[PDB]
Design a protein around this ligand. Structure first.
Ligand SMILES: COCc1cc(C(N)=O)no1
Ligand SMILES: [Cl-]
Ligand SMILES: [Cl-]
Ligand SMILES: [Cl-]
Length: 163
């Protein structure tokens, strides 16, 4: 475990993370995809061997000794708000199980279902709150990655609010 488990946020490419493992915002078919998933494919392509997994699950594949946790959030274009919310919460619960099983002291994680799977809605708060629900009981240092300057400020504020 980390000596004083923390949350932090950084605005940069998650493929340049300084953590002991990474969470990919994967598609269910283990395809290279776009956004976070394409960056992850370019950096760790060996981790896409048999990485296909259903919505609401996470599947870990090693790139050398570096773990890539493929977490599949729902595409809110296809799911109802209700069913999508349940699957987005479940994906993060499976991430916490994998992070625990791997024994890592730190994890880089993107906000699942906030990009092309968002169904055109701002889901910062929804996705971040499901992240916290899952990861609060783990003792890994969590570093959240994003692209947008306004999102960095809002994620930082939400972390600081809990102290
Ligand atoms: C905010 O989604 C766009 C995005 C983020 C990234 C990344 N590499 O973290 N690539 O595309
Ligand atoms: Cl960058
Ligand atoms: Cl997304
Ligand atoms: Cl972002």
């Amino acid at each position: 475990g980390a000596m004083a488990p923390s949350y932090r946020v950084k605005r940069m490419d998650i493929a340049k993370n300084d953590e002991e493992c990474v969470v990919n915002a994967a598609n269910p078919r283990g395809l290279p995809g776009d956004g976070v998933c394409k960056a992850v494919y370019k950096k760790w392509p060996e981790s896409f061997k048999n990485s296909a997994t259903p919505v609401g699950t996470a599947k870990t594949v090693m790139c050398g000794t570096y773990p890539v946790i493929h977490a599949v959030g729902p595409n809110f274009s296809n799911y109802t708000e209700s069913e999508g919310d349940r699957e987005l919460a479940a994906a993060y619960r499976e991430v916490a199980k994998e992070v625990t099983r791997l024994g890592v002291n730190s994890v880089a994680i993107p906000l699942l279902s906030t990009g092309v799977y968002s169904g055109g809605k701002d889901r910062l708060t929804q996705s971040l709150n499901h992240l916290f629900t899952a990861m609060d009981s783990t003792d890994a240092d969590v570093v959240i990655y994003c692209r947008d300057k306004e999102w960095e400020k809002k994620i930082s504020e939400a972390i600081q609010m809990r102290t």
